[PDB]
Structure formats: C-alpha cells, structure tokens
Amino acid sequence: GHPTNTADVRKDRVVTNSQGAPINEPFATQRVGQHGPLLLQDFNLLDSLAHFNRERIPERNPHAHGSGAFGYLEITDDITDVCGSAMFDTVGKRTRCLVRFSTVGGEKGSADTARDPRGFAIKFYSEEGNVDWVNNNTPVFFIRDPSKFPHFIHTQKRNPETNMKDADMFWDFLTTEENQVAIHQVMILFSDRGTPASYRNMNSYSGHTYKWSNKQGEWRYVQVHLKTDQGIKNLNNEEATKLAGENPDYCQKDLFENIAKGNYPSWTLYIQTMTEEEAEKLPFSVFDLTKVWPHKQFPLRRVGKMVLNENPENYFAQVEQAAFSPSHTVPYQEASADPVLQARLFSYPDAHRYRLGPNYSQIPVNCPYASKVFNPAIRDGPMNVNGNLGKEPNYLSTSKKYQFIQQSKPIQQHQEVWSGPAMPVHWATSPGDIDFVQARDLYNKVLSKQPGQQKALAHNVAVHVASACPEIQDRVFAMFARVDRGLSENIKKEALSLSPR
Amino acid sequence: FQGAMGHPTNTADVRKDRVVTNSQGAPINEPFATQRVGQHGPLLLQDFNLLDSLAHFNRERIPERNPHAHGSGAFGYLEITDDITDVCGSAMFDTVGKRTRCLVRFSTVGGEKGSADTARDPRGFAIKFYSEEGNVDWVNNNTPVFFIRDPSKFPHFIHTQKRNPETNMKDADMFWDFLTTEENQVAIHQVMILFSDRGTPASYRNMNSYSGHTYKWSNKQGEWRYVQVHLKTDQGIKNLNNEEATKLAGENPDYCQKDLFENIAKGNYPSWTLYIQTMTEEEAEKLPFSVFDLTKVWPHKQFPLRRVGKMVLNENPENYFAQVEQAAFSPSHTVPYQEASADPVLQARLFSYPDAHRYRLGPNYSQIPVNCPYASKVFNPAIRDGPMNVNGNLGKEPNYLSTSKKYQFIQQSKPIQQHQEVWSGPAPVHWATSPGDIDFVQARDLYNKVLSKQPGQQKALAHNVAVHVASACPEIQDRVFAMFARVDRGLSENIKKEALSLSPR
Amino acid sequence: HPTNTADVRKDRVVTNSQGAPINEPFATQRVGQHGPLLLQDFNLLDSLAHFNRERIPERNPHAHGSGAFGYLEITDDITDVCGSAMFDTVGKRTRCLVRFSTVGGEKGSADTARDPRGFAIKFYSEEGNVDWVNNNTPVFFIRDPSKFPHFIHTQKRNPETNMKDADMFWDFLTTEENQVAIHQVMILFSDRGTPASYRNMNSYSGHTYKWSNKQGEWRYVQVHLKTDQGIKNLNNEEATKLAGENPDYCQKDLFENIAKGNYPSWTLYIQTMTEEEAEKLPFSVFDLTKVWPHKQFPLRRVGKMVLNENPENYFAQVEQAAFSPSHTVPYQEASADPVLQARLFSYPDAHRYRLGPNYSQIPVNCPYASKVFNPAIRDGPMNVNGNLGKEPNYLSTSKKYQFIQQSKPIQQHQEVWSGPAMPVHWATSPGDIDFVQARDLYNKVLSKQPGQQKALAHNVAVHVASACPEIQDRVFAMFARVDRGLSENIKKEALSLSPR
Amino acid sequence: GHPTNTADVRKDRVVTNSQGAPINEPFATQRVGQHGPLLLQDFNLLDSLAHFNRERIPERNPHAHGSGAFGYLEITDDITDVCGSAMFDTVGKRTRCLVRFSTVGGEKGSADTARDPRGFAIKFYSEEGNVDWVNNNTPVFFIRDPSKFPHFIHTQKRNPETNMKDADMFWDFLTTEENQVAIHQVMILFSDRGTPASYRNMNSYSGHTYKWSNKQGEWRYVQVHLKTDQGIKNLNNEEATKLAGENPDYCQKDLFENIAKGNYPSWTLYIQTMTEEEAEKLPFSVFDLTKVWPHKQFPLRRVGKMVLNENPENYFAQVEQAAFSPSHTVPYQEASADPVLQARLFSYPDAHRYRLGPNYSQIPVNCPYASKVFNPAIRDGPMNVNGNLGKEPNYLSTSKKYQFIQQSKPIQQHQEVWSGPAMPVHWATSPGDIDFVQARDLYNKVLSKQPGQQKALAHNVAVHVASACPEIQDRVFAMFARVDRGLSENIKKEALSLSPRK
Ligand SMILES: [Cl-]
Ligand SMILES: [Cl-]
Ligand SMILES: [K+]
Ligand SMILES: [K+]
Ligand SMILES: [K+]
Ligand SMILES: [K+]
C-alpha cells in the first residue's frame, strides 16, 4: 500500500499491550481471589480503558460529517500559458489526490441526506508541495463578509438554550437586510441540488476567484469547475427525509461500494480565466463570493480528469485526521483579495492545530510525501514523531548549506497595486438589484429548463419556513418576492396551509 | 433593588448596558467591518477582532463523550419521603422532607453527537446530587442489567455497537459476532431488554432508572447492606415501536430533547419514585447467582422494593453546552456511607470516568459551575495549579499539611469498607459465560413471565431482532438464531422465519 | 480584589475534589494490612492524577519571571494626545498587574542571567484591558518578524547538545543581514544586561504606537517608564555568583520590599511626533532598532505607577497571566512597525495554546471593569462563567445590542498606504545608518559612566571566548564598525582566555 | 542510524514550509508596499510563528531536568534460575537501552549540580516488549505511603505564595512525626552523594523490591544494583554551588563530551534475591522502600554490564519525549506490594498521556521496535501516525487469527496469598528505633570509613536549615539526635552560628 494509506500489522498475530508486551489472556483482570475487588496493578486493563477514553478528538466546525477517497488528477490539456505549477506542466502527468466530501451543519452522527451544501475538498500531493482546493458543490456562498461566518454557522446549527435546529434564527439572519446577499446561495440550497443523490453525482467549484500565473510572469483571475462524469442527480425533500431515518450513511455506502467494485467516479476539470482589464469592466466584483462569472462571456476550458479509485484503509487515520486549508498552495497559484477567502487562509491552519495538534503535518495522510518538509526553524512540539531533523541546526547556520529556489518567481508583487488607508469595511447588501439578479437568472433561465424544479424550490422552502413564527415567515416571503413574485406566492400558500394563523 | 439570582449551578452574567465587546472587554464599534487596505484590498493582520472571533470559533468544540455522546438534561430535586437511616447514614437521607438538588443527563449509548434521539439503545439516566457531604453521582442506565460482567470487554463491546473501522458504518456482523461469541453470551439478558419495545422509549419522561450494580450502604452504627436502586417513572412506561422510531429518526432526530424541554417549560414537571432493594451478607451467600454480577436482577418477591423518596425535574438548563455538555458524572463520586461493591464492572468504572473527564474537559473540570459541589466546597491543600485554574487556587494556603495551620478531618471513626467483606486469595479472572442455564434463566423468565403478560410484546421482540440481524451474513444469523433458542425455541423460530423472509437464501 | 483573592472553607474541613470529606489524610486502601493496592481508592487516584497535571507549558520566551499588582495615577493632562478613559482625568487611578521576566532562560533558570528583562503591564480599564508588553530597553535585536524564531533559538539551547552555544549565538548576530541587531547587543552587554533588581530598571514601549484624541488627531508615541529607585546594575561576576547562591534573587527582592511597604514606583513619560516630523527623519519610526533622540523629541510627563500588592498565589496570578500588544483600548493603536504587527497575532495564539481557549475567563485575565459581552463567542473547553446563558449566539433582531463610539475612527483617519503585496526582507542597510546609534551609546552615554566602556568589552570577551576563532573574528570585526578601541579591548581579553 | 535515534533530511537542502512548498526568500514578509502593514495572507510567516508558539510541552513533574544517552546491556552471567525474561536468556546477549538522568526538584532550567537525588531510568527494548527500570541513584526514598508524594514533592519545590524554595516547609514536612521515616534518605541526600560529580560516577538502584519468576514457576523477591565502573565521585557543597552559577549544564556536558570522544561509561549489574521464608523472618518489611537489604545476609550476584555509547541526535525528540514507567514490564518481572511502587504503576502512564499525548507510544524513542504493538481494541486518538492497524477489526473477530502466547505462565497468582478486608492504612513512622537504625548504620559503619564525611554531612544540613525559623531548626536538631547526638551537636553548632538567636 501507499505510505499515505497503509498500516503495519504483526504477521505472527501475537496480541500485545501498548508497550509490546504479550497479553496471555484477552480478558482476564486481576482481583483478590476469584471475586474480590480489583487490584490497581492491572496495567493491561488500565492501558486499554485509558486509551478508549482518548479515542475521540474534537469534530470539525463546520463540516464534521463526511466521507473520503483517494485518486489522481490526470492532465489532458496544456494550460501552461495560464499556470506554471508543476502539477500542470506536462500533458499526461498524474498527481495523487485525496478528497473529503461532507455536509456542513450536521454533527458527526447526522444524516448524509440532510439539506446542506456539500464540501468537496481536494488535497493534491505534488512535487512543489501539497496544494488543497477546499471547495463546496456550489459556485457561491452565503456571505461576503468573513466576520459574519461564525454568526451564520451558529444560526445553521442548534439553539444554545434548547439544543435544537431553529427556523427562527435560521431565517432571522438570512432576512436581515445587510445579510440578504445570501439569497443566491439560498436559492441553490433549497433547490433539489441541496439533497444530492450521492457524492458521485455532484460538482465542485472553487467558488472564490484565485490568481494563477505562468512562468513568464503573466497572470489571470481563475475560477475552477469540476463537473461530474456521472451526471447530476438529486433527491427530493421526502426521499431525503426518509433515507435520513432509514439509512443515515447512504452516501458513505454509495461511495465506498462503488469504488470497491470498480465503478470509479470521475470528474472533468475546467477553468474560467479573466484579465485584469476585463475584471474592472464587470458590473460586479471578482472578489464577491456570492457572484458567478457568466459562461457565455467566460467559457470553460478543459484541463484534465480526476478519478477516485481507492478506498481508505482506516477511516479515522485517513479521513477524520485529514487536514485541508486554502492556504496550502503551490508556486504560481495564489488567493485573490476575496475577503472571505482571505479569512480562510488564517482560519484553517489554526483549526487544525487545535483539532489535530501542532505537528498534524506529520500524520501520513497529511504528509507532503512528494516534497519532504525541510525547515530548520520548525522544530519540537508535542508528538514530534519524524526525528525533528536530528542534529540539524535550528537556524540558518553559516556552516551549512540551504537552497532557496525560485528566487525570481514573484508571489503577488506583479499583480494588483493597492491604495488607501487601513479601512474597516462592512460589505453589506448593495442597494438596487445587483445582489438579486443572479438569483433571478437562476430561477428564470436555469430551473425553468428543468421540469418541476421551480415548484420543488418553493415546496422546499415552504416546509422549512413553516416552523418559523409569523413575522419571520412574512420577512421570508418579502425577500423571495424580490426574486420572483410567483415564487414568493407559491411559498406563502404552501407555508400558510401548514401553519394557519 | 437587586433582582433574583438564578442558581449558581445554572446561571449567567450578561452586561445590563448590552455593550458588545471583544474577548478583552474593549468595545466593538461596528459588528462586521474588517480592516483591509482601501475598500477591497487584501486583509490586514492587525484586525484583532476578526482573528479573536475566528480563533474562538475554531475552539468551540470539545471531544464527545465515549460512549453516551448524545443526550439531554434538566435540573430538579430529590425529596425524602421515608426514613431509611437504618440502612444509610448519608446526609442526603438524614431528614424526611429534605430536598437535595440534582442534575440529570439522559442519553443514548452508541450514537454520535448528531444521531437520532429515537435510536434503539439503552438510555443513560445519570443523576448528580449536590449534597452537604459532597456531590454523589448515580450513573445509571434505564435497565437493571448490562451486556458484560468483565470490564476488559467494554472497549471491545462498545466498538462493535459503533462504526466499522474501515467503512465507517454500523455493522450487524460485528454487533452479533461479539454478542454470540460463547464467552460473551452472558449478554443475553440485556439483549432481550434492548430488543424489546423498551429499547425505544417514547420519551425520557417514560422510562425508569436503575443502579444496575449492587452498592454497599452503611448506617451510623456500622451496619451495612447490599443495595440496588430503582427509580420508577410516575408518568408510566410508554414505548415506540421499531417503525415509529425509524420514521421519527428522519423527521425529528431531537424528538426526546424537545419533549423534555417543552414539558418542563410549560410546568408539566416529570417525576419518579425512588426505591431500594436491600440484602444482608448472609442472604447473598445463599443466592444461586452473584450480587457482583451485573447481568442479574434480584427477584421482587424475595427482595421487595422499599420506598425512599420522589425525584422531580423542574428546571431546564440555561445553556446546553455550559451545563449539559460539560457535565461530569462518575460512580466514584460518592458521599460518606455509600460505597461501591466488588462488582468488577463497577470497580473499573471508578477509574474510567474521572480519567475521561480529565481528558474531555480538563484537569480542573470540578471548577466548572455545574460540576462544583456548591453545598460542600473543596478544600484540599495538595490539589493545586493545573490549566484553567479559575477559583483562586486557595491563595496563599500552604500546599501541604503545615504544622502552623489547622486542618479538620471529620468522621475519623467511620469505616470505609474495612467493616464489610473479608477477602482472601492471591492476586486474573475471565468471568466467561457459565455452564448450564444460570446465565440464561432470567432472560427466559423475562420472556415467559413478564412479556407474555403484555399483549404483542413477545411478537415485537422477535420482530425487532429479525429486522436487525437480517443485515448479517448467514453464518452469523445462524449463531443468533441458536443463542435465542437457548432462551425459547419459539422466540427463535419467530426470529428466524422473519429474518429469512427479509434475507432469503 | 477579584483579580487577586481566593475562597477557603472557614471550618478547615479537608475534602476531595468533589467536596466529600476525607477522614484520614494519608491512609490508602489495600487488602489486609500490607497487600496490594485497590483500584477503588478514589482519594489516592484523585490526588495523584491532579499532581500529574499541575504543570502547563512555559512561555516561549520569557518563561521565568515574577509579578506584582498596583496602579497608575494620572498626574498630567495628555488628552490632547490620547482620549483613552484611563487618561481622561487628572488624579485618576487604574489597577494594574506587572510581570517581570528574563527572555532566554527556562523556568527555574537564574534571575541574574544576562538578558533583556520583560516589563509587561496589564491595565484594567473601563474600556477594556490594555497591555503594554514592554522590555527594559527601547530597542530590540530584529526588525524582520520572520527572524524571531531563528533569533530566539540561537539564544537558547543547541538542539543536539542541549547547551547554550556561543557559536550559534554569534553566528546569527554577525550574519551581515542581521547586524542591525548591533544596538541591542551593545545594550545587552553593558551592565544594564544584569540589573540589580526589577525595581532598578526602566520599561520602554520599544515600538512606536499611534494615540488619537477625541477630536480625531493622532501622533506617533513612544512610552518611557523611568524607575524612581534609580538604575542599579550588577557586574558579570556578581551576577554569576548570585546565579549559584540565589537563583531567585530578584523575586526575593520584589516580594520582600512590597511586603515591608517599600513600594517601588516609576514615572511615566511619552515622546510624541507627527507624521510630518517622521517623514523628515533619517531613519524610520517603524524601525524597532532605533530610538528617538531626547533633544529633538523631549519627554512629557503623564503620571506615576506604583506596585503595592504581591500576588496571593504565584501560579494563579503570575504564571497564568496573559499579555498581548493586541489587547488595547480605544484611542491606542499599533503602528506599522513590522515586528509589532506580527506580535499582534503571535500572543493571542500562544495564549490559546498555553492556557486554553477561554483563558480570558481566568480571574487575573478577566476585564473586571469592562465585562465581556459578545454573542458570537461561546462554548470552548472550561467555559466557567455560564456562557451567557440563553442569549442568542448571533445578532437577533429581537434583542438589543449597543455598539458605542461608532463615529470614532480606528486607523482610517491616519496613513494612506500604496503599493502591491510585496515580500520585503528589511536586511541591514549599507553604510552606517544601522550603526550610528550604537556608536552614540558608546561615545556619548557610556563614556560618562566610569568604567562602563571597559565593562562592555569585558562582558563580550568572556562570552565570545567560547566561540570558534572564525566566529570570534566576525565578532571583533562587527564591534570595530562601532569603535576601534572597543574592538581591540574585546580582542585582547578574548584571545587571552582562548589562545590559538 | 537506529530507528529510535535518527532523522530524515532532504538531500537537496531545499527549504520548505510545513506543507512542502518551497520558500523563495528566507525572511521576506508580505506587506502593502515597502513599509505598509502586514498582510494576513502571508502563510509562511504565520506557519513559522504559530509553530514556534507550540514548541513547548509541560515539563515532567518531578524530574523535569535531565540528560540521556543510548547503549546496550550485555548478559555476562546465567540467572535463568531466577528470571525467565528473554533479555536474560543467553549469555552474551545484548539488548539496546535508553537512559535518562535527572535531578528531582528543580525545573527545566535548574542546575545540574543541585543537591538532590538523581534519577537513573533505563528503558530496555526487548523482544518481549519494552521494560523500564525507573530507578534513582539511592536504594531508598523519603516515603513509604504513596499519598504523601504530592505533599513531599510540594515541600521540595517552590512556596505557593512567594515562588521560592522554602526551608521551613522543607523541614516542617520531614520532621512531622508520622513522616520521620524519611530520615534514612535524608541522611543520604545531605551526604556528599547528594551532589555527584557526574552521571558517570553514580549508581542506580531499584529501591523497591520486585518479584522475578523462572520458567519453572519459582520466584524470588529481587533488588537490582547498577554499580558504576568509573567509581563514585562527589562534589562538596561549595563546589556544587559555584558550578551552578558557572555552568548549570556541567553534567550534561560531561556525559555528552565523554561519549563523543569514545570514553563510554559503564555499569555492572548485580541483584539480591530473597525467598518468601527469609522475608517472614526479617525485622523489617521487604515492602518498605526506606529499608535496604544488608549485603552480608544478601550478597550481590553479578548479571551483566551496561554501556552507554551513543548520544541522542535531537534532545527534544529522544530525551524530552522519552516516557518511562515501572508498569512497562516484560514476562517474568512483576512488582511487589510495596505501596509506593503500587501507586507508581498508575501514575506514570497517566502522566505520559497528559504530558506527551494518548499515542505517545508511537513516538520513535518510545516505540517497541523489537516487539511491534498489535492490539485490535487500542485505536484512534489524536496524532495516530502509524496507520492505526488499517482495516483490522477493532475487537476479536471470529473471522481472524489472534495468538495469545504464554497462556500457562502465571502473572502473580503463584506468589503471595493476601487476606483481610479492604483496609485504609497510614504507614506512619513506627515507634521505637526500627526506622532510625539503618540511618545510624550509615553514619557509624559507612560514612566513618570516608575521611571527613561525617562532618561534611553535618555541614551540608547546617547550611540548609539555617534559613529555617528557630522552632523548625530545633525539631531538626532533635530528629538527627535520634540518629547520633554528636551529629546533632555538630549541625546545631554550625546552624546557630549562621543564624544567632536572642
Ligand atoms: Cl489527560
Ligand atoms: Cl491551539
Ligand atoms: K463564485
Ligand atoms: K442488576
Ligand atoms: K524604538
Ligand atoms: K530499598
């Protein structure tokens, strides 16, 4: 097996304690005589019980519930005019990758078929380091101010007094006028793509703009699109609810079983690109996470194919302990000034250090096995397991040699020129229609081409908001009316039948 | 004038002026503005308020309990209604009519934090009493027995009730592989109860609580007795059936949490009646089973219930995380005149739970308000320091027994256990299933003498098993069929016929 | 005081950690009189397990230190400069906590080691806790924040041998790009590198900060706390002897003088400068390795700080104290000094690891005069204050929330930045600009203190004598850029101690 | 290099961040323009700084300060009649080992030459698992009640208010009447052996009695003695103090440099053995840690030789993270009912799980490389780095093969028969003279043979207790007077000169 996905099991099958001493009876415990009280000196018992007390680590916040598989990305098209990263430098080049799929709001034991965005995070083990594309299955998101993220997530989870989901706080936050820029993602969430039929039947999107540069120093704004080679397939609200009770692990079973039998799912990787000149002529901001780039003006360009063909050997070791961050990147790939993206560069490594520990990059699944770590000044820390570079100095000693490559490759100094004071900005919902037009285009130009999808959207909102108090229901109705008056009336009618006044 | 304070175990401190601040008390002048260069340049490192918010968010979660991760809680009291001072000298019993405050956490066992309230499972029913002699915890399930009588089998047993280490899914094969392994079949009594309709109660208000183990209670004259605790619901037993439980798992995974909270919030306070069984050392040597065996009950006819008091739950928690998630129970948390018996499962629990608390919550978890013994404050000169020491650490108190200071050790003439059993022998025992029928007979008595009197319950037991084992491979299925036939041939045939109809060969 | 007190049972009844009384201090349960021990002795395991958890990770750096409580009293009106509440009234007193420390030594190392001293101050104001996280020098060794882990490593133990190491110490400091450290190195190897006690040293902001008034004008600021007990220093031999004979020499001095009523005090001053004055300087106000000469930027008095209360419990109040330059109040902001900018991140992050995520609920760290209220900051291990009860954990439109000072600017009224996102390594400048102030110390300051010029050379010589000859030669060359004679004095003494 | 002591460093020397991406400038940090404020998007800076903030772990409590070296034990004599452990089964057999030397009371940055017992802990990496001999450089200790350990250690450390060593509490605890059984170890501590000249010049002792069995089922009470082949050498009080100031790392330096130049230090391993019948007849208890077995009745028997010949490559990775416990044992070696030892079986694994992490046995220096761990039910936990047994079931699946060897070898059921109720016992200092006589034998029969030692002991106590208040000083004089009146007069005379009275 691969070093990122293997184990070592004694071939003699001799059972031992945690110090390698053999156990001569699996279950006998020491006491006085046959039935006296237990003796403190029973090391083997306390060893087992104490480790059992420490099996659990803190769940992710959010995206606690999820599934993973290994695979590779194959390059099928030459895009070196856009991006100089090694993983792209040769048509036919394969890079190993790890994917973790997840829901968002649910805790570890929640159901696969809950309504939620799904995470679709990808770790590529390249020769220039491990690069993570920490993506969802939607090209947009609920917010464009990162300070709102904890608030939003709190309202998607449990009430702090009652410990239950709460439609009142769910929609209270979404209808606050400064927050209504979430309406694009809300439409997507309550369409039937909020309950995918399996992880094999969904897409992955960068969501944010990134900046990709070539080896000549030209660069572009980039959007990433991973389209499923299995086709889009969705559940309806009632199929999702029924499966939740009858099989909370439906999507994990689908993924694992299809890989185990050889029905490996695949995706086609495309990108959108945009020049700095094109970006300034836009009627919206390339830094706005709630906006998409229209396909007609910015067509998709093919790059390669991703295949998942390898199940994890141990879920905890390879999936639960997997760590992804957007700030894990490679030369020639950078983040844009999207403020949500900027905040994620800090948040994820900080989360990993708490959830997994300071030396989490030494966990095999997280190791950059194709670009070994060598930093003299990153040393020690609990559970340092790889030798801590031995007697290497912990500073840049003039008695030693150190190679700093790509000294002439700019990072971001060749890109935008910023100007202004240090300025606090609350990017509240803009006036006029700009923050609603893409929601209307989704309804009028996309869902209309799908039989019955406009109605399913209304039904999916109605049954959810029907739990909210009347004044909140009314705010929800008014917000959707800004998108389409008929959509608003369909929600109102169904919602009111389920909750009369 | 000052207002009414909430109880110290269940309260909060919120600025009257509603001024929003950061984690260091400085005011925030705009809730969501973040600093960048210009209007839309990249974010600046110097935005303390953003990073403060985001790093604390990253640390909201602590590891879930293992097991019993999912649950609910409420506060109430135990009121003593009868004089049992002849049995037990503890302060909590020393006066008829006296109330001790308590916290109850109800839980399932196998499911993770976000699993369904209505899953089939034993339910935990843990009680913390804040007495004048310290906090005493009664860490009980809603059944009088359990799956094991060897403590070393607990990690193994719990693993097979949870997820497969490769596929991350519940696995009927390993569930039943463990329970039908010959040395483990002493679990059959508890399995019968698990697979009856009591395995899916209609709400926490409609189930019982049992010590499960034998404990030892002593009076002030030095006499002692073996004791079993029974808390019987005054609302009555009410159960869901398997299909009702499954459908609710999908439509309302928090069904029992909602029921407890809403009934308390509206004043429909649930209560239970507290009883004990008692036995002398002479009687226990005459029994055909062991009082140290967790898989056995004491028959009511020979050991009738004796009333003690009434427990009422009448106060919801103000903050679920602060009072329920951080609550810490242990059977080794006890008071004078109540002790554990040599039940080997109970003995291991004395060690396990304080150790889990120290990892899950922190070494100073007894300083969290819900866990503090507010009616008997801690004073130990040698227990000092540690992370998140928040109560002053005894200030300048010497950290040993200094001859210049006064230290009072009360109850010096009260024995701990040296007045009870006399042990004899050298220092390892695997208490595997016994030969013959002793480990199957109480399961048969439940089937034939108890469930037979409840219309439809014998049929529902076979159904609940059949639908569960139908997912297992045939070799495991046949072992399951055979084990149940040791209880009753007809129960076995019913399970088999239905299981095979669900998974024909 | 809430930051410095405890609660001890008045009946003196000894109990376990759950409040149950212990009926014998030391008896342990076993079979018979001398059989093996029983698992069921909760009282033994309770004590033994908590003992195993007494220790938390030491600070990195500044692990070794001492603390006291006191107050700052305002004696002058500086509201023209700063509108903070703690300054708004002459005669106003704010409670404070001070932690003194060394830098490189671990817990248990000697008080009298040669080192900078930390002199960190926490103020408990009505607008929040503001920390002035200062050293006893107005400068420091680096002006690139990325070099801090490297520098601190070379000041501590070799990763193979676990010993202090003159070779890595001086290798790093003589690396051309790093020689901007020369100013602090002069200061470190003067006798002020071994103060006679914490009462006999100063405190300096080191960095430039930005202070604003209620009218919206602002100034660059340097803070100076000058000891009213006078400067008193040890020499290298005195400090060494005390390291062996009383490694707690300075902790003993502070505690006993406070206990007997000889309360130490300091006089608080500031220097101020406008953006225009700063643009004309031959150096940068963002450079930590530079000072503002007193004649062009005279000191202005503000008030007095007094320490008059020892902690009741060292661990609870000193070891657990959390200071950060990012703990600030309205009208005090950090400057674009790149070292200071990085410190705004580092200290909260260290606190969350060293102390725990809810470390601000520890009494000494609690803003007792401006209690915390943030709906979105909840849960976390050892949440001990009720977690705001049933308050929503977001901004519910059914509740009220007051955001005060909405029209008070943060930094948007100050400098206008311009440029791309630029990686910058602020390496040592060519020419003399990064050496002239070191030379000014030697020729204009130490020359007026009899024997201090010789003592500096002696202090360097005895230290570098352990370094290999090539490192020795780089050290001699580096000091020769400051002064020829200084270099020659060092060289004579070093070569006599390590002949070739 | 050996797997317990090696590293992996990129042969191209390319410097990277913690995710393996190359760094193209060692110290440049991103800001707006040349001197604007720093940008949050500089992952490399925060990566370095946040890992710096997590370098430290809690120090050991106690024995925080120490030094370590690797080596081997060679068996030179046949003791299979006493012990059946694999590490003894063949003359000439070598087992690799790790030793950590330490002081007791001082923190990490304290001085090597402090007055203290020295820890001398040995981890052996055998074919039957890792077995640890967690010894001090003295054959006795201050206590025989385990509940007293936190109290005792607290009084040896800093005062909780002043944060200073405190002779009043130091001696208050030791002169408390129930605690005076500490006198034997106190005499040893304040002899000049309380300040060894180096780790190479001291011995190691089990202190406790252990129980060792042979493959035929016979067993013996056993004491282990590791005697230095370099000879005992000590500092005196004034030399140790001066070195504390001039080189707080004197003993670490001595060990490291002597190993690096080929002057490998060694020890000769001996054991004492005693049958159950002989222990019934002793005037003291083999379960008493404050008692030794006199050589004349129980001579030493040679076993082998230990050599330390390999320095650690990285102090933190191999020394600071090393985890020792007396409950880490192998077949045929078991602990006695010595109550102090019994408590240690619990304390050390509990400490390790806090200080290092639940999966600390996967840190290379603590791994049993000669007996890989295989336990299906021990799984997951933070920083599980060895693959976690892959898809192996986490219980004893009836579909797999599991081998339990040595099923017919007893653990302890072949040894003592205990009897009685669960009894709380405080093993306070006994009345009469039994807990003082061995301390007197040290003074009169041992220290007398070393010129000036008897006076050096009085001096070492005097200079220490002179800081104590007069009420406490008098208690100390009276306690030593129980040992020898001239000794007590000598201590009193010098202490009163250093602290005169009214
Ligand atoms: Cl722990
Ligand atoms: Cl952390
Ligand atoms: K987008
Ligand atoms: K029972
Ligand atoms: K400065
Ligand atoms: K001994």
Architecture of chain A in CATH? Answer: Beta Barrel
Q: Residue share in helices of chain A?
A: 25-40%
What multimeric state do the chains show? homotetramer
Bound molecules: chloride ion, potassium ion
CATH topology grouping of chain A: Catalase HpII,  Chain A, domain 1
- Kindly give the count of domains of chain A: 1
Indicate the proportion of strand residues of chain A: 15-25%
Spatial separation of the terminal alpha carbons of chain A: 63 Å
Largest protein interface, residues of each chain:
A-D, 107 and 107 residues
Helix count from the secondary structure assignment of chain A: 13
Largest sheet descriptor of chain A: 10 strands, antiparallel
Rg of chain A computed from alpha carbons, rounded to a whole number of angstroms: 26 Å
Order of helices and strands of chain A: HEEEEHHHEEEHHEHEHEHEHHHH
The total count of strands of chain A amounts to: 11
User: Structural class, from helix and strand content of chain A?
Assistant: alpha+beta
Question: Class of chain A, according to the CATH hierarchy?
Answer: Mainly Beta
CATH superfamily of chain A: Catalase core domain
PDB class: oxidoreductase
Keywords: Kluyveromyces lactis, Catalase, Heme, NADP, oxidoreductase
Assembly: tetrameric
Entry title: Crystal structure of a Fungal Catalase at 1.9 Angstrom
